[PDB]
Structures are given as structure tokens and as C-alpha cells.
Write an enzyme that holds these catalytic residues in place. Sequence first.
Site, PDB file in Angstrom:
ATOM      1  N   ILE A  33       0.826  -1.200   0.000  1.00 18.81           N
ATOM      2  CA  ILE A  33       0.000   0.000   0.000  1.00 18.81           C
ATOM      3  C   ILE A  33       0.861   1.251   0.000  1.00 18.81           C
ATOM      4  O   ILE A  33       0.372   2.356   0.241  1.00 18.81           O
ATOM      5  CB  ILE A  33      -0.949   0.033   1.222  1.00 18.81           C
ATOM      6  N   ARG A  35       5.223   2.563  -1.385  1.00 16.41           N
ATOM      7  CA  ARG A  35       6.589   2.215  -1.748  1.00 16.41           C
ATOM      8  C   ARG A  35       7.556   3.339  -1.406  1.00 16.41           C
ATOM      9  O   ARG A  35       7.450   4.447  -1.931  1.00 16.41           O
ATOM     10  CB  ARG A  35       6.672   1.893  -3.244  1.00 16.41           C
ATOM     11  N   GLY A  36       8.501   3.045  -0.519  1.00  8.99           N
ATOM     12  CA  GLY A  36       9.503   4.025  -0.152  1.00  8.99           C
ATOM     13  C   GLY A  36      10.897   3.552  -0.505  1.00  8.99           C
ATOM     14  O   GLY A  36      11.081   2.439  -1.001  1.00  8.99           O
ATOM     15  N   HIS A  37      11.886   4.396  -0.241  1.00  9.40           N
ATOM     16  CA  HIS A  37      13.272   4.069  -0.541  1.00  9.40           C
ATOM     17  C   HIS A  37      13.838   3.080   0.479  1.00  9.40           C
ATOM     18  O   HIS A  37      14.711   2.274   0.152  1.00  9.40           O
ATOM     19  CB  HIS A  37      14.113   5.348  -0.555  1.00  9.40           C
ATOM     20  N   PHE A  38      13.338   3.141   1.710  1.00  6.28           N
ATOM     21  CA  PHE A  38      13.811   2.264   2.780  1.00  6.28           C
ATOM     22  C   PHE A  38      13.067   0.933   2.802  1.00  6.28           C
ATOM     23  O   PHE A  38      13.500  -0.018   3.453  1.00  6.28           O
ATOM     24  CB  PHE A  38      13.650   2.943   4.141  1.00  6.28           C
ATOM     25  N   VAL A  41       5.348  -0.274   2.262  1.00  6.39           N
ATOM     26  CA  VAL A  41       4.335  -0.289   3.312  1.00  6.39           C
ATOM     27  C   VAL A  41       3.346  -1.402   2.983  1.00  6.39           C
ATOM     28  O   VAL A  41       2.941  -1.555   1.831  1.00  6.39           O
ATOM     29  CB  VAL A  41       3.559   1.048   3.366  1.00  6.39           C
ATOM     30  N   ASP A 149       9.684  17.999   5.157  1.00  4.11           N
ATOM     31  CA  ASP A 149       9.070  17.515   3.920  1.00  4.11           C
ATOM     32  C   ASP A 149       7.550  17.609   3.953  1.00  4.11           C
ATOM     33  O   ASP A 149       6.852  16.670   3.580  1.00  4.11           O
ATOM     34  CB  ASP A 149       9.501  16.067   3.654  1.00  4.11           C
ATOM     35  N   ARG A 153       1.205  15.223  -0.451  1.00  2.44           N
ATOM     36  CA  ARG A 153       1.459  13.790  -0.607  1.00  2.44           C
ATOM     37  C   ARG A 153       1.851  13.147   0.720  1.00  2.44           C
ATOM     38  O   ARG A 153       1.804  11.926   0.855  1.00  2.44           O
ATOM     39  CB  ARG A 153       2.584  13.549  -1.622  1.00  2.44           C
ATOM     40  N   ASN A 154       2.243  13.969   1.689  1.00  2.00           N
ATOM     41  CA  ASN A 154       2.801  13.464   2.942  1.00  2.00           C
ATOM     42  C   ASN A 154       1.875  13.674   4.127  1.00  2.00           C
ATOM     43  O   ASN A 154       2.268  13.479   5.277  1.00  2.00           O
ATOM     44  CB  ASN A 154       4.154  14.122   3.204  1.00  2.00           C
ATOM     45  N   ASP A 167       4.731  11.174   7.226  1.00  2.00           N
ATOM     46  CA  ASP A 167       6.078  11.180   6.658  1.00  2.00           C
ATOM     47  C   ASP A 167       7.080  11.934   7.534  1.00  2.00           C
ATOM     48  O   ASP A 167       7.776  12.839   7.071  1.00  2.00           O
ATOM     49  CB  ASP A 167       6.071  11.799   5.254  1.00  2.00           C
TER      50      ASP A 167
HETATM   51  C1  LIG Z   1       0.035   6.659  -0.228  1.00  2.00           C
HETATM   52  C2  LIG Z   1       1.060   6.417   0.877  1.00  2.00           C
HETATM   53  C3  LIG Z   1       2.134   5.449   0.407  1.00  2.00           C
HETATM   54  N1  LIG Z   1       1.680   7.686   1.252  1.00  2.00           N
HETATM   55  C4  LIG Z   1       2.207   7.962   2.501  1.00  2.00           C
HETATM   56  C5  LIG Z   1       2.605   9.398   2.787  1.00  2.00           C
HETATM   57  C6  LIG Z   1       3.125   9.703   4.000  1.00  2.00           C
HETATM   58  C7  LIG Z   1       3.283   8.680   4.973  1.00  2.00           C
HETATM   59  N2  LIG Z   1       3.744   8.666   6.201  1.00  2.00           N
HETATM   60  N3  LIG Z   1       3.655   7.369   6.666  1.00  2.00           N
HETATM   61  C8  LIG Z   1       3.140   6.617   5.707  1.00  2.00           C
HETATM   62  C9  LIG Z   1       2.856   5.144   5.746  1.00  2.00           C
HETATM   63  C10 LIG Z   1       3.895   4.399   6.587  1.00  2.00           C
HETATM   64  C11 LIG Z   1       1.445   4.900   6.253  1.00  2.00           C
HETATM   65  C12 LIG Z   1       0.953   5.056   7.551  1.00  2.00           C
HETATM   66  N4  LIG Z   1      -0.378   4.728   7.574  1.00  2.00           N
HETATM   67  C13 LIG Z   1      -0.772   4.362   6.321  1.00  2.00           C
HETATM   68  N5  LIG Z   1      -2.035   3.972   5.976  1.00  2.00           N
HETATM   69  C14 LIG Z   1      -2.186   3.649   4.644  1.00  2.00           C
HETATM   70  C15 LIG Z   1      -1.162   3.697   3.676  1.00  2.00           C
HETATM   71  C16 LIG Z   1       0.131   4.109   4.094  1.00  2.00           C
HETATM   72  C17 LIG Z   1       0.342   4.456   5.466  1.00  2.00           C
HETATM   73  N6  LIG Z   1       2.888   7.406   4.610  1.00  2.00           N
HETATM   74  N7  LIG Z   1       2.357   7.008   3.415  1.00  2.00           N
END
Ligand SMILES: CC(C)Nc1ccc2nnc([C@@H](C)c3c[nH]c4ncccc34)n2n1
Length: 289
Positions: A33, A35-38, A41, A149, A153-154, A167
Site C-alpha cells: 500500500i 513504496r519508499g526508498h527504505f 508499506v 518535507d 502527498r505526505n 512522513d
Molecule cells: C500513499 C502512501 C504510500 N503515502 C504515505 C505518505 C506519507 C506517509 N507517512 N507514513 C506513511 C505510511 C507508513 C502509512 C501510515 N499509515 C498508512 N495507511 C495507509 C497507507 C500508508 C500508510 N505514509 N504514506
Amino acid sequence: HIDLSALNPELVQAVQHVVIGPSSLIVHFNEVIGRGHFGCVYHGTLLKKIHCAVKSLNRITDIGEVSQFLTEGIIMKDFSHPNVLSLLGICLRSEGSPLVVLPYMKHGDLRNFIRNETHNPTVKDLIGFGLQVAKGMKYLASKKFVHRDLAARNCMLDEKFTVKVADFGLARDMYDKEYYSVHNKTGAKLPVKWMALESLQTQKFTTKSDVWSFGVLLWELMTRGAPPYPDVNTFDITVYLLQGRRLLQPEYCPDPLYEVMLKCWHPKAEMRPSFSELVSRISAIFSTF
Ligand SMILES: CC(C)Nc1ccc2nnc([C@@H](C)c3c[nH]c4ncccc34)n2n1
């Protein structure tokens, strides 16, 4: 494969405040759900079953990097505010880097939410989301935490349409690589089109440069998720701003809200509003709707 004995004992104690045992966590590795660099998810279940998001850090294998990342992010466990993403915990295991467990955000990230054509959020809806972000940032600023950041998107939206600034801390990553560029003084991938002029010049980030980014986020909201400066090359963002040029007023942005945006982009950081001021100003604008 990370051994706890190699990490700083102070850090280990902090982590052990929020440890989740492997038997309490089920991860669905076939359900990505994010995709990050590290790492990616995944959909997870935390045990009474709680739906959660599990952030992998498996791409970070070096102990020095794991330690740095955990050290910088663990403060997340000390934050609590309705508009700031919380930490459920950290799953340590014998094989693999730690898994970060976060609340699941049913409605995804704010940018995709407002870009969704079936949603068609109104101006009132969008200003409301911006107010929520301002309140989350007001909290982080009060803890002297610099985000670095902030962008639509974050931020994320939970089941009740509460916006969470996300994020950061243990959830920090690059979740959309399109908007990060190495064309800057650090040579690292940075969100240059969200960065304050003085950050592009000096490489330093402050709460006042978070305020700049928040102004860009407001512009994103008013345009329902248009990319900022689509006609400005990443090579040119610094000179563009030096010339005093700024994002233009969106068609459906109220004049007073555009004034708020412009205040956020004042070339002198000290002249920009605090997040406390932003909450007050945006609340008044919101109330006219
Ligand atoms: C669309 C998703 C990949 N974008 C983000 C943006 C910021 C962020 N900060 N943490 C996350 C993840 C780890 C996350 C936490 N709860 C979620 N619920 C649904 C989908 C991704 C996450 N993101 N993800």
C-alpha cells in the site's frame, strides 16, 4: 539481521518502550500500500485485531544507518495530537530490519484524495483540510520539531476524514520519487519545489521553512493536487524565487487565502507567520464558508 547489542543502550531503552512482539503482528506481504526508498508499506493486523500499516526498513541493512534512523525518529512516540500521525510501535525480530507499525489511514494520502475525480472536494472541504494541517504543524512546532518535507502527498486521511501530518520520524521516506531532485547544494534527493528559498541557499531547515512548505501545500489543496511550478525546471527553482516570482493564485482560491500563501513565502523567514497565526487566519477564512 540487526543485533540489539550493537545499538546504543539509550536508544535500545527508548525503542523498548514501544516494542511489538512478532506473535502480535501479522503482515500481508502480498498487499503493498506504499513504496519508499527504505522499504514498502504493507497491510497488517495488530493483535483483538487492529488494522495497521506496516512500514518496512529492510533496504537499510547497515547498523550505523539503522541506528541513525531510529535515533532521529523515536521521538515520534512522545507526540500525541489528532492531526499528527501516531506510532503504534516497533516490531523487532531475529531476521530483518525493524518493522514500524503505524495506524492505518483508510483514505490514503491527501494529494490522491483531492485529485480523485469522484470526490470533488469543495473549497470549504479543502480549506478545512488545510486548517487541520495547520493545527498539526502548530503542535509539532511547539515541540521544536522541524518536519522538512511537508507536502500534500505526505499528509494522510483516516476513516473519520481527520488529516494526519505524516512522513516524519520513523515513517520518514520518499513515497513519490517524481518530486525529489538531486539538483540542489546537498546533492541528495530533496523536495526542491516545496523548499524555502533560504533552505535552497544554505541547506538549513527551520520551522519557518516548514511554513513556506505549508504555503505550497495550501496551493496544492486549492488546485486539487496540481503539481507546483510544472513549467519551472528543477535547475531554475532557486533563481525563480530569487527574482521574487511565486506560485500564482488558483482559480478557486479565495483572495484572503492567497494572501496567506504569499505571507508563507516571504523571502525573510522571520517575517513569515507562525503556525499559531496560520491557524487563526485560516480558521477565520474557513468560518466564512
Ligand atoms: C500513499 C502512501 C504510500 N503515502 C504515505 C505518505 C506519507 C506517509 N507517512 N507514513 C506513511 C505510511 C507508513 C502509512 C501510515 N499509515 C498508512 N495507511 C495507509 C497507507 C500508508 C500508510 N505514509 N504514506
